[PDB]
Design a protein around this ligand. Sequence first.
Ligand SMILES: O=c1[nH]c2sccc2c2ccccc12
Ligand SMILES: [Zn+2]
Length: 200
Amino acid sequence: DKEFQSVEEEMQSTVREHRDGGHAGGIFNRYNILKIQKVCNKKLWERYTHRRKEVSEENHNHANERMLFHGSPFVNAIIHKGFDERHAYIGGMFGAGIYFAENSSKSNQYVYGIGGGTGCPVHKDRSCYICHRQLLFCRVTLGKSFLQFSAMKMAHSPPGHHSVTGRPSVNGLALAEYVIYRGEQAYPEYLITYQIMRPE
Ligand SMILES: O=c1[nH]c2sccc2c2ccccc12
Ligand SMILES: [Zn+2]
């Protein structure tokens, strides 16, 4: 399948060297991709496309949709119930939103919790090469995205906007991040099962 080879290529090509030296997500240059499953949840898809149409109408007939990664210990709940701002990451740089990355390795830092938590449930290892991890590769409606470089604790999108884009800056972010404040603005399209690989 070419659709899944495209997803594997985005997963592999967006890995970056992290400033924390692998503390949160583990030490690796690449992944062993085990499975890529397309999520087909009609009710969530309709909730997503309904909101996408509304955002497009409010953003010069443009949804500003992007495919982005999301890491969480709650990926199974997300696939069944959808993203939910009532469970937003309050401690985030941009406040109470749902965070996405264009770099798979940034999302990998969140798979076992904030700052990687205590790592895998079996070995309590943030750099476990044994346990299988899951990431989501999502359709995200950004609409009119508010560009921000420094911490700005929001409860909702800035007035007239549909999302926040965190841009890299000297004093701030190493890599971009994208924040929505309404769960219906993302669809968990692909579930990726993988392992991080021990460097060569
Ligand atoms: O993929 C992400 N998952 C989660 S879960 C709590 C925070 C984040 C997060 C933060 C910045 C960029 C990506 C992510
Ligand atoms: Zn493990």
